[PDB]
Amino acid sequence: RLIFDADWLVPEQVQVAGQAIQYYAARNIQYVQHPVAAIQVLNVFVPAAYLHGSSVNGYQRATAPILMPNTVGGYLPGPADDPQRVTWPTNAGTIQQALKRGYVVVAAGIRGRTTVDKSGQRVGQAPAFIVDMKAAIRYVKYNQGRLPGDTNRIITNGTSAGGATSALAGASGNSAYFEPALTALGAAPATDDIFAVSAYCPIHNLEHADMAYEWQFNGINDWHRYQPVAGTTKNGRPKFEPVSGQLTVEEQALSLALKAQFSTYLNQLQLTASDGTHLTLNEAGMGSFRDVVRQLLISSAQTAFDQGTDIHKYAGFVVTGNQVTDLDLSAYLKSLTRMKAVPAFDQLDLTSPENNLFGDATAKAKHFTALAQTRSTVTAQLADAELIQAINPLSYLTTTSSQVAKHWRIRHGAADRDTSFAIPIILAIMLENHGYGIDFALPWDIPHSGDYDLGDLFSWIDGLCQL
């Protein structure tokens, strides 16, 4: 089975800026033979021209890129998207623009940490999210020819946890680690390596995210964030309430310890400059690597200033003429503010989204770092090291065990405090160090979000496929 039938494609149209976008849709397609959750279906959207042997933006049915966006956030379930969807979470606007650009779009539903089967058993914890993304990719590739588009031009996209999903799909192509799970689900007999990766603020490298967060925010003892509460705003988005707090002495001590250990972690990665020089951090969190973070923020400010943006908002920058000449990084960070407490990801009481992600058939949640396991304030288990490694995109760049996508586009807002800037920077440099194509940027004053630069994203995609 799992044979795509073009007859399932039905005509639809959406108005995009006074202009009508004609396309065809095939929805709620089960992409595995033995699904365990209703969310495991995908939707296919095709520009109308591809049913007429015509072209769009230079692409045809046989050559159109296949964009595979996901709606995963907080490592929660991500329902199959639709260009006509308006309910949160959705990137419907992106699909609309993608169709207009001539891309075929396959939006797959992905299991999340709260997904339970018919009996109430948790079936969406790690590595369910990536197993589903891979199953969806295999479905698409297995159906080359039957499905419009070029299955050799699959480009994943996602934001936050969804960005990590996209990155992981590109990094772990055809990894044997996931074969047992895919076999159980009865996924299509095809490969799952992809062409390119698009990822916005990928919340990945979770087992080292606590150290990175404290390297960045140590010394800033007040945190500020918004927690979802009962009720929803427009289109199903949960209502939020501002919450803040002060780190206890114990948390401040934990923070310093995490920051200190980040130097060791960072140094052992052996990240290098274009000339082979090793980037490092000293015992105080200062050094060549810190310089990179500072410089990236200076570049971010420069780019915005050059485009007419008033960069006098956050403290720390020094401006000479029309040039941003320096930055007091500590001042900027204090101005930006700390969002999460300590640890930011592996909470001692197992209450974070990541703790829940690492739970399994037995435990609702688990720790995923030796530090939090050792200092756990509740009865807890430490997640399997092999599993932690398997869902970290970086693992595939240090050890050969998969076919890695050759093209990457990563973005993380300069005002995004959901994870340290060091996290996406490490990914970007490691990719460059291993010869992969990487387009990276830290967009000025952009919060935790994604799909805010479609003009540039689509330009990058067209450059890879056509240009």
Three-state SS at 294: helix
What is the dihedral sign for C-alpha 110, 115, 118, 122?
A: positive
From 71, 5, 61, 2, select the one nearest 30 (Cα to Cα).
2
End-to-end CA distance of the chain: 37
- Rounded to an integer, what distance in angstroms lies between the CA atom of residue 411 and that of residue 456? 11
- Measured CA to CA, the distance from residue 61 to residue 23 in angstroms comes to 12
Residue 284, CA atoms < 13 Å, CB-side half-sphere: 3
Around Cβ 119, how many Cβ atoms within 10 Å?
Answer: 6
CA separation for the pair 191, 424 (Å, rounded): 27
Burial of 458 per CB tally in 10 Å (0-12, 13-18, 19+): buried
Helix (H, G, I), strand (E, B) or coil at 230: strand
What is the rounded radius of gyration, in angstroms, for the C-alpha atoms of the chain? 22
DSSP H/E element including 439:
strand 437-441
**What is the set of domains in the chain, with CATH numbers?**
1-467 (3.40.50.1820)
Residue whose structure tokens are 């890695």: 404
Parallel, antiparallel, or unpaired for β 323-327 and 437-441? unpaired
Residue 97 structure tokens:
């623009």
Q: Give the integer Cα–Cα distance in Å for 264 and 259.
A: 10
How far apart CA 155 and CA 196 sit, in angstroms, is 5
**Where is 217: in which H helix or E strand?**
helix 206-217
This structure's resolution (angstroms)? 1.7
Report how far residue 210's alpha carbon sits from residue 206's, in angstroms, rounded to the nearest whole number.
8
User: Where are the extended beta strands (E) located within 88-233?
Assistant: 104-108, 154-157, 196-200, 222-232
Instruction: Give 87-112 as a DSSP string.
Output: SSS--HHHHHHHHHTT-EEEEE-B--
Give the span between the Cα atoms of 207 and 261, in whole angstroms.
Answer: 12
DSSP symbol at 384? P
Q: Which of 43, 35, 33, 105 minimizes the C-alpha distance to 451?
A: 105
Amino acid identity at 324: V
43 close to 26: Cβ distance less than 8 angstroms: yes
Please, which residues bridge with residue 154 across strands?
A: 66
What's the token pair of residue 394?
A: 């970086």
Nearest residue to 394 via CA among 422, 431, 364: 431
CA 192 distance to own-chain centroid: 18
Q: Give the amino acid at 374.
A: T
Q: Which helix (H) or strand (E) holds 323?
A: strand 323-327
Output the CA–CA distances (angstroms, integers) from residue 142 to 43, 74, 189, in the order listed. Answer: 16, 30, 7
Q: Are 181 and 218 in contact (CB under 8 A)?
A: no
Side chain identity at 391, as an amino acid letter? I
Which residues lie across from 268 on neighbouring strands? none
Identify the three-state secondary structure at position 238.
strand
Structure tokens at 198: 């698009």
DSSP notation for 2-45: ----GGG-EEEEEEETTEEEEEEEEEEEE-BSS-SSTT-EEEEE
